[PDB]
Design a binder for this molecule. Structure first.
Ligand SMILES: *[C@@H]1O[C@H](CO)[C@@H](O[C@@H]2O[C@H](CO)[C@@H](O[C@@H]3O[C@H](CO[C@H]4O[C@H](CO[C@H]5O[C@H](CO)[C@@H](O)[C@H](O)[C@@H]5O[C@H]5O[C@H](CO)[C@@H](O)[C@H](O)[C@@H]5O)[C@@H](O)[C@H](O[C@H]5O[C@H](CO)[C@@H](O)[C@H](O)[C@@H]5O[C@H]5O[C@H](CO)[C@@H](O)[C@H](O)[C@@H]5O)[C@@H]4O)[C@@H](O)[C@H](O[C@H]4O[C@H](CO)[C@@H](O)[C@H](O)[C@@H]4O)[C@@H]3O)[C@H](O)[C@H]2NC(C)=O)[C@H](O)[C@H]1NC(C)=O
Ligand SMILES: CC(=O)N1CCc2nc(NC3Cc4ccccc4C3)ncc2C1
Ligand SMILES: *[C@@H]1O[C@H](CO)[C@@H](O)[C@H](O)[C@H]1NC(C)=O
Ligand SMILES: [Cl-]
Ligand SMILES: [Zn+2]
Ligand SMILES: [Zn+2]
Ligand SMILES: [Zn+2]
Length: 779
């Protein structure tokens, strides 16, 4: 810890120095390890950040913050407006857009550098609403590649999102699950302010700067000390870009605390928000003028990205737990835009999580939060598989806060809500030689950017949650060539091999090209399964799970909906293609006083009364709680036809999911913790459906030319409907709302089932990857 060393010729050095030697890098202040003369040498402020006519051609002065002398360009330390003020050049923003067909890099550069320009709390709508006061940002957006919005991860907080951006991982995977955290194993607490956040034990996965370095690509600093002004951060980046070939980094990051800091105080659209936006734009202009005078403005790839948005949240819109609970002082609450509940540690044996959940469940007619046990949270959130995530979670309504008591105005804005909320959406602009020219791309999730960033730098990405190749349509070149995964298990195609009389399943029945549009799903794990054909549907029957892994069927715009005849209500027929030993039985359901069953292919949509008998095959049967049957029957009887009629037919792929450890991955048979009473029949934790049709709705789903359109859900298989506060009413008043909350990507279903969809289409694989990452938000 020898502070007696000097920073002379070491200001913002890139090589990290360990003890005893003192540091001169930007993180030295944060770790309290700077050399005595760091602030004096490295953080000059004299005469500001802009050149003036009088300073042009000046004699170099060490005291100045930046220089206006003739040697400044070669030294890489001019003020960013030098050539404009002194050499009569124009500002980058005043030039017309010229396509960058190839990188125009100075000799010596191996690849175009990447500059990640990150802005905190920069909401998607600021692009259009603030465009008139942001001309530099408007030029980047209009002449580069932009998305109308980028979806952040849940929680829509800073640390979980910036760390997702760096790693391509969900917060539950990288460990930064919140701005405030408590690890029970460490018995320590992570906070926005404190020295505990500096410990490396909290930060999982592999961030971009580590990915780069491990592959021999030099990485600049991503985290900046708060005391370093934005102008100095920009000048430091430009100085590093002026270094010799063998020392020059290829990846850089800038960070701005704004517009977030002002957003919290004045709300997202507070009149006070114009100044911070003008400021961020001025900083962009400085970077761009700075790159132009270094002849790098047509060589560097720039990413303008946000971490989350900002909502209108006041203290009048606060919900108090003291209005629901008796023991509010006996609980710890992570409050605000989300809620995480923990018991207070000492002499609190009467603490019951079930009582806290029951007392927070549908108590006020206009209640502005909903409690959940973390494993019951919508799967799309990926917010469960981490010990730092408390079991009790409160999903708070947009514009609302949760607090313990009136004890605990100042703020007009906040963020942290569900990542599907409009106000939480952020920005994405890609500008440079590798991005497309004047191109708009569809919205995407920030988990996807890490792979793009690796691709832009020629790196092999570490394993992450992005879908590599899903964002190829953003790039002019340097595209990753994705390949479909190899199918592990081949299917069996059984014929009639069993006699009806061989089946003693305790079942009774008064029975005396079109449906698989995109090829069969590929099974990517080792298992035994049969493909079963029928007039109205096709399935992939699992011998181990004793039910289909998938069921595929097409419903045309004009399909007729029929009812289950009175005499077929309890009909279950044996399937002569599957062994009685590899079949389910009715006696297990009769003996399970809490479990009933349902069917994957809906009997309501049979093409004829004769065809309807196939829907009652024991091989189309799945276990279902009576409460869930209310949801499933309404989906099958009413909603599938509604979608077919609205989308000009639909192709449906339904099936079970098993995720007992809530890690978002397919369970192995040993991970299943519930079976139908005294049977080998596993109980699914969820049920899915993938509903596909033609993007061009003038074309029927079964005769589609061009892109596809999809919507999917992962419904929780619950023994009650406590999640839905109106569940006592008719299903037409609550089932659809439930389903919209549990909307999913095809990719989320793929991880949970070990299946690979859309293997046989007329579309490019890159386009199919984009389709698999699509989330239908209803927002
Ligand atoms: C989102 O994408 C994620 C990434 O792919 C998916 O998460 C992965 O899931 C799998 C399966 O669950 C899991 O695999 C297991 O790994 C076990 C060992 O785990 C430790 O090591 C890995 C790898 O470390 C390497 O990488 C890191 C940087 O990322 C580096 O620091 C290491 O030094 C090491 O380097 C080597 O690789 C890198 C490239 O990655 C090279 O650059 C380098 O040169 C080296 O070659 C770590 O990632 C794990 O990290 C977890 O734990 C630490 C400490 O607690 C946390 O800080 C960290 O945040 C992370 O925590 C999260 O995951 C754990 C589970 O791992 C959760 O419990 C937790 O709640 C968090 O969610 C570990 O330190 C291995 O034993 C195991 O083996 C089993 O299966 C095999 C069959 O293959 C059997 O033979 C065995 O008997 C075992 O049963 C298995 O391979 C990955 O570890 C996990 N990765 C991460 C980052 O979480 C995720 O599923 C996906 N999400 C969805 C929904 O799809
Ligand atoms: C002052 C303040 O609120 N914080 C929290 C976030 C932060 N982030 C960065 N760099 C970021 C980290 C990162 C991660 C990915 C991509 C770009 C960047 C720049 N630097 C400092 C700070 C400090
Ligand atoms: C739950 O509500 C009941 C009835 O209002 C009350 O008796 C009980 O103490 C409450 N429990 C908690 C833990 O808040
Ligand atoms: Cl938090
Ligand atoms: Zn933030
Ligand atoms: Zn904030
Ligand atoms: Zn699992």
């Amino acid at each position: 810890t020898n502070t007696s060393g000097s920073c002379k010729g070491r200001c913002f050095e890139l090589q990290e120095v360990g003890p005893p030697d003192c540091r001169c890098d930007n993180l030295c202040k944060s770790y309290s390890s700077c050399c005595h003369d760091f602030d004096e040498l490295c953080l000059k402020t004299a005469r500001g950040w802009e050149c003036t006519k009088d300073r042009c051609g000046e004699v170099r002065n060490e005291e100045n913050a930046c220089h206006c002398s003739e040697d400044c360009l070669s030294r890489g330390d001019c003020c960013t407006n030098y050539q404009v003020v002194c050499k009569g050049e124009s500002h980058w923003v005043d030039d017309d857009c010229e396509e960058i067909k190839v990188p125009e890099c100075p000799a010596g550069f191996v690849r175009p550098p990447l500059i990640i320009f990150s802005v905190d709390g920069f909401r998607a709508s600021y692009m259009k609403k603030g465009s008139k006061v942001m001309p530099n940002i408007e030029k980047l957006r209009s002449c580069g590649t932009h998305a109308p919005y980028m979806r952040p991860v849940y929680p829509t907080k800073t640390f979980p999102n910036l760390y997702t951006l760096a790693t391509g991982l969900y917060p539950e995977s990288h460990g930064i699950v919140g701005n405030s955290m408590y690890d029970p194993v460490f018995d320590a607490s992570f906070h926005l302010r404190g020295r505990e956040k500096f410990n490396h034990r909290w930060w999982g996965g592999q961030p971009l700067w580590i990915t780069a370095t491990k592959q021999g690509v030099r990485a600049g600093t991503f985290f900046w000390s708060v005391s370093i002004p934005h102008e100095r951060r920009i000048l430091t980046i430009l100085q590093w870009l002026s270094l010799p070939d063998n020392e020059r980094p290829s990846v850089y990051a800038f960070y701005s605390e704004q517009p977030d800091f002002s957003g919290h105080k004045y709300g997202p659209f507070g009149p006070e928000m114009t100044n911070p936006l003008r400021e961020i734009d001025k900083t962009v202009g400085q970077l761009m003028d700075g790159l132009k005078q270094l002849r790098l403005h047509r060589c560097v790839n720039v990413i303008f990205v946000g971490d989350h948005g900002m909502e209108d949240v006041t203290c009048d819109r606060t919900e108090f737990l003291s209005n629901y609970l008796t023991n509010v002082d006996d609980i710890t609450l992570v409050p605000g835009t989300l809620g995480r509940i923990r018991a207070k540690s000492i002499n609190n044996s009467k603490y019951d999580p079930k009582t806290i959940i029951a007392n927070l469940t549908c108590k006020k007619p206009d209640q502005h939060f909903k409690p959940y046990m973390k494993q019951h949270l919508p799967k799309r959130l990926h917010y469960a598989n981490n010990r730092r995530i408390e079991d009790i979670h409160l999903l708070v309504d947009r514009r609302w806060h949760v607090a313990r008591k009136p004890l605990d105005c100042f703020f007009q804005g906040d963020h942290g809500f569900d990542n599907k909320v409009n106000s939480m959406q952020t920005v994405f602009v890609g500008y440079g030689p590798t991005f497309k020219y004047r191109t708009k791309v569809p919205p995407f999730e920030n988990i996807e950017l890490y792979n793009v960033m690796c691709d832009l730098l020629g790196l092999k990405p570490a394993p992450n949650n992005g879908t590599h190749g899903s964002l190829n349509h953003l790039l002019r070149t340097n595209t990753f060539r994705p390949t479909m995964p190899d199918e592990v298990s081949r299917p069996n195609y059984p014929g009639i091999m069993y006699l009806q009389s061989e089946f003693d399943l305790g079942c009774t029945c008064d029975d005396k090209e079109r449906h698989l549009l995109y090829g069969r799903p590929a099974v990517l794990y080792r298992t035994s399964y049969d493909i079963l054909y029928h007039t109205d549907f096709e399935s992939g029957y699992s011998e181990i799970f004793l039910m289909p892994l998938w069921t595929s069927y097409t419903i045309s715009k004009q399909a007729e909906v029929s009812s289950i005849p009175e005499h077929l209500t309890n009909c279950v027929r044996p399937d002569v293609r599957v062994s009685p030993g590899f079949s389910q039985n009715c006696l297990a359901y009769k003996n399970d006083k809490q479990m009933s069953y349902g069917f994957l292919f809906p009997p309501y949509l049979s093409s004829s009364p004769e065809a309807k008998y196939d829907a009652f095959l024991v091989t189309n049967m799945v276990p279902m709680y009576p409460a869930f049957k209310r949801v499933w029957a309404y989906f099958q009887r009413v909603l599938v036809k509604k979608y077919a009629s609205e989308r000009n037919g639909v192709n449906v792929i339904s099936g079970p999911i098993f995720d007992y450890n809530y890690d978002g991955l397919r369970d192995t048979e040993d991970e299943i913790k519930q079976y139908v009473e005294g049977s080998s029949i596993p109980v699914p934790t969820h049920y899915y459906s993938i509903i596909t049709s033609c993007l061009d709705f003038t074309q029927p789903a079964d005769k589609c030319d061009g892109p596809l359109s999809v919507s999917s859900f992962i419904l929780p298989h619950r023994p009650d409907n406590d999640e839905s506060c109106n569940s006592s009413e008719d299903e037409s008043k609550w089932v659809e709302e439930l389903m919209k909350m549990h909307t999913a990507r095809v990719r989320d279903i793929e991880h949970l089932t070990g299946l690979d969809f859309y293997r046989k289409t007329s579309r490019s694989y890159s386009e199919i990857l984009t389709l698999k990452t699509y989330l239908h938000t209803y927002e």
